[PDB]
Every structure is written in C-alpha cells, then in structure tokens.
Amino acid sequence: QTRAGCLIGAEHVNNSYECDIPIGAGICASYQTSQSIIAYTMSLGAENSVAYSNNSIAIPTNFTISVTTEILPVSMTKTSVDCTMYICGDSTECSNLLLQYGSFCTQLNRALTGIAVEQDKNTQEVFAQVKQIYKTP
Amino acid sequence: CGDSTECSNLLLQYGSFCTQLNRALTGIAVEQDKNTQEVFAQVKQIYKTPPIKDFGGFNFSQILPDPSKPSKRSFIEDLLFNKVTNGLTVLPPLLTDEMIAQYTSALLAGTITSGWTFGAGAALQIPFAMQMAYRFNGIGVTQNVLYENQKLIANQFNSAIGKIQDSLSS
Amino acid sequence: KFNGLTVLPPLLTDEMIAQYTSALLAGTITSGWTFGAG
Amino acid sequence: TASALGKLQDVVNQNAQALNTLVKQLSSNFGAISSVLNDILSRLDPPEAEVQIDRLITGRLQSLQTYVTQQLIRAAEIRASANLAATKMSECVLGQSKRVDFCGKGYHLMSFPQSAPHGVVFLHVTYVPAQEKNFTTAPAICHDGKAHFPREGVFVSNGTHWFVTQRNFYEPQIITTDNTFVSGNCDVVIGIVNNTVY
Amino acid sequence: VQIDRLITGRLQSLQTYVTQQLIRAAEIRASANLAATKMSECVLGQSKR
Ligand SMILES: *[C@@H]1O[C@H](CO)[C@@H](O[C@@H]2O[C@H](CO)[C@@H](O)[C@H](O)[C@H]2NC(C)=O)[C@H](O)[C@H]1NC(C)=O
Numbered sequence: 067q068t069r070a071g072c073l074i075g076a077e078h079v080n081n082s083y084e085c086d087i088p089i090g091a092g093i094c095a096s097y098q099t100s101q102s103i104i105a106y107t108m109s110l111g112a113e114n115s116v117a118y119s120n121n122s123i124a125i126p127t128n129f130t131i132s133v134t135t136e137i138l139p140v141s142m143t144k145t146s147v148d149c150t151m152y153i154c155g156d157s158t159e160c161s162n163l164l165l166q167y168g169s170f171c172t173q174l175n176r177a178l179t180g181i182a183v184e185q186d187k188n189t190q191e192v193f194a195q196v197k198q199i200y201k202t203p
Numbered sequence: 204c205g206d207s208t209e210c211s212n213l214l215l216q217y218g219s220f221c222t223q224l225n226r227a228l229t230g231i232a233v234e235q236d237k238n239t240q241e242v243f244a245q246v247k248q249i250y251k252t253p254p255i256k257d258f259g260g261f262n263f264s265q266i267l268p269d270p271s272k273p274s275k276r277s278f279i280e281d282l283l284f285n286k287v288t289n290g291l292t293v294l295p296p297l298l299t300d301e302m303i304a305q306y307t308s309a310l311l312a313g314t315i316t317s318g319w320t321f322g323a324g325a326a327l328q329i330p331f332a333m334q335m336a337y338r339f340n341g342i343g344v345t346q347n348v349l350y351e352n353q354k355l356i357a358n359q360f361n362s363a364i365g366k367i368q369d370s371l372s373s
Numbered sequence: 374k375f376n377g378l379t380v381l382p383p384l385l386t387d388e389m390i391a392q393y394t395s396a397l398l399a400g401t402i403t404s405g406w407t408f409g410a411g
Numbered sequence: 412t413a414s415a416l417g418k419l420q421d422v423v424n425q426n427a428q429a430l431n432t433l434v435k436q437l438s439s440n441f442g443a444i445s446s447v448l449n450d451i452l453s454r455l456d457p458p459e460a461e462v463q464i465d466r467l468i469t470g471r472l473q474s475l476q477t478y479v480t481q482q483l484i485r486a487a488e489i490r491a492s493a494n495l496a497a498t499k500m501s502e503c504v505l506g507q508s509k510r511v512d513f514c515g516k517g518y519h520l521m522s523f524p525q526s527a528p529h530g531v532v533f534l535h536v537t538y539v540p541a542q543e544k545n546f547t548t549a550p551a552i553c554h555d556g557k558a559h560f561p562r563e564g565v566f567v568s569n570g571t572h573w574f575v576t577q578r579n580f581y582e583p584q585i586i587t588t589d590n591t592f593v594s595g596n597c598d599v600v601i602g603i604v605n606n607t608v609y
Numbered sequence: 610v611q612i613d614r615l616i617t618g619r620l621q622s623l624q625t626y627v628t629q630q631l632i633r634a635a636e637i638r639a640s641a642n643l644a645a646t647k648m649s650e651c652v653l654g655q656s657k658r
C-alpha cells in the first residue's frame with residue numbers, strides 16, 4: 067500500500083538505493099537479485115559533515131583537467147501540406163462546396179510558410195558569425 | 204459520454220481525438236517533476252551542520268532547521284507555508300516536502316561552512332570572518348574595512364533579519 | 374506522400390555547416406579570443 | 412552507446428508520430444456512408460452528395476486546424492533552444508566566461524563545437540582540485556604593535572612556522588614586508604597572533 | 610440526431626481547455642528556468658551582474 071495506490075507483485079525492503087523507475091510519494095521500484103521486482107523509499111544520497119572550527123582550513127595541493135559534452139537541438143523538419151488537395155482530393159464537386167468557407171486554407175498555408183521561413187533563421191544565427199573562413203596551418 | 208453504450212457506439216466515429224488528448228495531458232503532467240528536479244538537486248552530498256554555532260556573532264537560528272517539531276521546516280518556512288492556501292483526478296507529486304526541506308538545509312550548511320567551494324569539487328572548511336574578507340574584496344572594499352568594524356556589521360545583520368519576520372507576519 | 378504532403382530542403386548544406394565549424398575551430402586555436410573582437 | 416543523443420531523437424519521433432496520426436485520420440467516416448468520396452459520387456446524386464460531403468469537410472478541417480495549432484505551439488520551444496545555443500556559442504566559445512555552472516561544472520578554460528543533425532554539441536574543458544591538506548590560520552599578524560594583513564592569499568602554519576600562500580594551490584613563501592600591508596593597531600582586531608616580519 | 614450536438618459541444622470545450630493548459634504550462638516553464646538560473650548562478654557564487 068502507498069499513497070498513490072495498491073501495488074501488486076513487488077517486495078518491500080528496508081534498504082534504499084537510487085531510483086531507477088519512479089512510482090510516487092518517494093516510492094520507487096526496480097528489478098534486482100533469484101531476481102525479482104523490489105520497491106523502496108528513494109534515497110537522496112550519501113550523508114556528510116564538515117569539521118568546522120576557527121583557525122582551520124584545507125588547501126588543495128593537486129588538480130585534474132576534465133571534459134564534458136553538451137547537446138542541443140537547433141532545428142525542426144519544415145513539413146508542408148496542401149490544404150485543398152487534402153480536403154477535396156482534386157474533386158470539383160467538393161471544391162464548389164469548400165469555397166463557401168472562404169480564406170481558411172489560405173491563412174493555414176500562411177502559418178506554415180512562417181514556420182518554413184523561421185527555421186532557416188534558427189540555423190543562420192547560431193553559426194555564421196565569423197566574417198572570414200579561416201583555415202588551419 | 205458518461206457510461207452510456209448508446210453514446211459509446213457513436214463516439215468512436217470521430218477516431219483518435221481522445222487518444223491525442225490523453226497523450227497531451229500525459230506529456231504535460233510529467234514535465235512538472237523535471238522542473239522541480241532541475242530547480243533543486245544541485246548538490247551531490249547532503250551536508251549537515253556541526254552542533255556548535257561559532258559564526259563570529261552572526262545569528263542563523265531563524266533559518267536553520269528546528270529539530271524539535273517533526274517536520275524539519277524552519278520557522279520562516281512555516282510562516283510561508285501558513286500564509287497561503289466525471290473522471291477528474293489528481294496525481295501526487297514525486298518529491299515530498301521533507302526532501303525539499305533536506306535539500307534546502309544541505310545547500311544552507313554548504314553555503315555557510317564552505318562558501319562557494321562546494322559547487323566546484325569537494326567542500327573545504329573556512330572561518331566565516333575570512334569568507335566575508337573575501338566577498339568584500341569582490342567589490343573593491345579592502346578587507347580590513349571589515350576587520351575594523353566587524354561587530355557593528357553583525358549587529359546590523361541581526362537586525363535586518365528581524366524585520367523580515369514582521370514583514371511576513373503582518 | 375501522395376496526399377499533397379511534402380518536405381522542403383534546408384538552405385544550408387551540411388558541408389557549409391562543417392566549413393563554418395572548421396573555421397571556428399581553427400580560429401579559437403590559432404588566435405584565441407581576439408578573432409571575435411577584431 | 413547511442414543513448415547519449417537521446418534529446419534530438421524525440422523531436423523526430425514526435426514529428427513522425429504527429430504526421431502519421433494526421434495521415435491515418437483520413438480513414439474515419441464522421442458519420443458518412445463511406446470514407447471514400449468516389450464511392451459516394453458513383454452511387455448517389457448531387458442533391459445527396461451535397462448533404463454528405465459537408466461532414467467529411469468539417470472533420471478534415473478541424474483535424475488540420477488541430478495539427479497546425481500543435482505545430483505553432485511546439486515551434487517556440489525549438490526557437491528558445493536555438494536562442495540558448497546561440498547565447499552559449501557567443502559567450503563561451505569566443506571568450507572565457509565566469510558564470511558559475513554555465514559551461515560545464517567547474518572552472519572553465521575553453522570549449523569546442525561540433526555539428527550534429529538538427530543540433531549541435533559542445534565540449535567543455537574544466538579544471539578541478541583533487542587533493543587537499545589541513546592547515547592552521549590567523550587573519551592577521553602583529554609586529555611592533557602594527558597589524559599586518561596579506562596583499563594576496565592567506566596565512567597558514569603547519570604548527571611550527573608561519574607562511575603565506577595563494578588560495579587555490581599550496582605554495583609556501585617567507586613572510587616578507589612587500590607581501591603585506593599595515594593597518595590600525597594590534598588592539599582592534601580579534602584572533603591576531605604575534606610573529607616576526609623580515 | 611440530437612446526441613451529435615452534445616458530443617460536438619463537449620469535445621470542443623475539452624479542446625479549448627487543453628489548449629489553455631498547454632500555453633499556461635509553457636509559460637510556467639520559463640519561470641522555472643529563471644529560478645534554476647538564479648539558484649545556480651547567485652547562491653553558489655558572487656555575480657557582478
Ligand atoms: C613546518 O614547516 C617548516 C618549513 O619547512 C618546517 O621547518 C623546516 O624543518 C626542516 C627540518 O628538516 C629544516 O631543515 C628547515 O630548515 C625548516 N625550515 C624553516 C623555514 O625553519 C617545520 O619543521 C614544519 N613543522 C612540522 C611539524 O612539520
């Protein structure tokens with residue numbers, strides 16, 4: 067039993083680990099070793115304490131360089147759709163009814179054209195801020 | 204459609220509207236927990252404070268946790284908490300208030316005991332009256348212009364915290 | 374794909390992109406920061 | 412493993428899913444006798460086809476409106492991400508930035524860009540101290556009744572002698588007059604300790 | 610005949626509700642990101658901004 071509801075087919079443990087899959091209200095579940103699905107209260111991490119008093123410091127004597135990646139998405143696929151081919155399928159019997167709803171399809175095209183113009187602004191302003199094409203020695 | 208088969212037989216003519224509405228709401232509901240996780244959880248180890256309070260005269264008992272009551276939320280936190288108040292369902296949040304109230308207290312003990320260092324590698328202990336002699340040097344005020352008049356500044360700090368309580372009380 | 378739905382190409386090709394990023398990578402190594410200011 | 416590039420895969424997954432739903436929607440009847448228009452036009456007269464076709468028209472209209480609205484909403488996330496990427500590129504590649512935890516998680520030296528499909532990747536080079544020792548300190552020293560303070564770095568003592576060092580890399584130096592400057596007098600400051608200066 | 614009117618009403622009201630919610634959440638997200646930015650830049654260090 068949890069705040070969230072009734073959980074069937076898991077074994078509670080008094081131990082606690084990082085959270086592979088979240089259930090709710092701190093309840094978390096995982097598959098572990100003789101293997102079964104367990105559920106437990108998620109741990110927040112290790113616990114630490116510093117010996118702080120006047121006239122005591124720690125000074126670092128050694129160092130390490132490191133590297134770290136970062137990934138961002140800068141563009142989206144500029145789809146386009148024909149309103150009247152989709153709605154009417156090149157049927158004149160359809161189009162002479164469809165033309166009673168006025169300009170709707172045209173403003174739809176306009177909206178999509180704004181997208182198709184905006185996305186190649188997005189690609190243009192991230193790169194292309196160097197005025198000359200340098201090359202390595 | 205309200206538990207009526209006469210309605211349910213006709214509803215499915217409109218295809219998958221309910222499916223994309225459900226995927227919309229389920230896409231929304233998850234994002235809040237990523238927001239919460241990102242805003243907090245900027246610390247990898249839960250620090251805790253020593254029992255003594257030798258902070259050079261600076262008073263921190265208003266914001267540090269109070270262990271006596273069961274929830275670890277401090278006094279000002281409890282004023283802030285007190286000042287605000289068909290198929291419809293509400294899902295519980297992931298991180299409970301005791302977790303937030305541990306995180307905040309860890310951030311606090313880190314910022315007090317070790318200054319900024321705990322954000323770039325392992326924390327290091329430094330006396331508070333030498334942390335202030337750093338943060339004053341960051342605005343072109345020579346550190347001695349603190350050591351000469353340290354006590355007065357502590358008093359003003361102690362006074363400035365006080366008014367905030369009344370500001371929240373009134 | 375025959376219902377009037379279509380896709381359009383980008384303006385910049387991936388080789389122009391790699392020219393830009395190779396110019397950036399040669400600049401930040403040969404001239405440090407200065408190539409940005411002047 | 413390819414799970415590193417999870418982010419820029421879900422944009423493609425969402426777009427393909429939305430387009431597949433928009434195209435599959437055509438199979439629904441909306442209450443007409445058939446989803447196929449020629450099946451109506453071959454079997455029925457214009458007085459009745461003009462009663463029927465309005466339902467399909469309204470359905471496909473509102474479906475295309477829903478699609479356009481979803482795309483109009485989604486575009487602003489991509490725009491805000493492109494602007495954040497442009498900011499990181501302008502500020503952290505062309506120069507060194509002091510904004511803590513803006514580029515990586517540590518003291519920042521430099522970064523390098525690489526291209527990717529519908530995206531970009533940065534590599535951030537960061538410096539971190541690993542080892543640390545214990546030292547005893549005093550915020551000032553007394554000599555001839557005058558309080559001396561350090562120009563840069565801090566005073567430390569292993570227990571027998573007093574030295575001054577820079578803050579982030581242990582390096583002892585003999586306490587000399589031009590490492591320090593004089594203020595006030597011994598009586599005013601707490602914790603000051605007696606010492607000799609050269 | 611009648612029930613289609615109720616269906617086309619309620620479905621439109623629900624679409625309007627979802628459309629409000631999406632915008633409101635997309636507004637909240639920018640305040641969440643600004644909060645996390647302040648947290649990261651001004652608590653763990655001193656900022657001359
Ligand atoms: C603290 O550091 C000082 C500085 O190195 C130590 O003093 C040195 O001790 C060695 C002993 O072999 C002498 O040869 C040096 O001439 C001393 N230097 C000076 C400047 O006097 C001192 O022994 C250290 N104390 C402890 C407890 O480690």
Ligand SMILES: *[C@@H]1O[C@H](CO)[C@@H](O)[C@H](O)[C@H]1NC(C)=O
Pocket residue numbers: 078079080
């Ligand atoms: C947790 O441990 C206690 C004592 O060690 C035990 O009595 C209890 O049964 C354990 N929890 C569960 C759910 O069994």
Ligand SMILES: *[C@@H]1O[C@H](CO)[C@@H](O)[C@H](O)[C@H]1NC(C)=O
Pocket residue numbers: 118119120255257602
């Ligand atoms: C702070 O210094 C005083 C004397 O200056 C000392 O009595 C006290 O124990 C110190 N506090 C510590 C070591 O926590």
Ligand SMILES: *[C@@H]1O[C@H](CO)[C@@H](O)[C@H](O)[C@H]1NC(C)=O
Pocket residue numbers: 128129130541
């Ligand atoms: C520590 O110093 C040694 C040499 O003294 C060096 O080889 C090592 O890379 C440094 N960093 C560590 C051990 O993290």
Ligand SMILES: *[C@@H]1O[C@H](CO)[C@@H](O)[C@H](O)[C@H]1NC(C)=O
Pocket residue numbers: 117124543544545
């Ligand atoms: C420094 O001294 C304290 C007190 O004995 C000890 O807890 C700590 O492990 C020592 N080393 C460092 C790096 O703080």
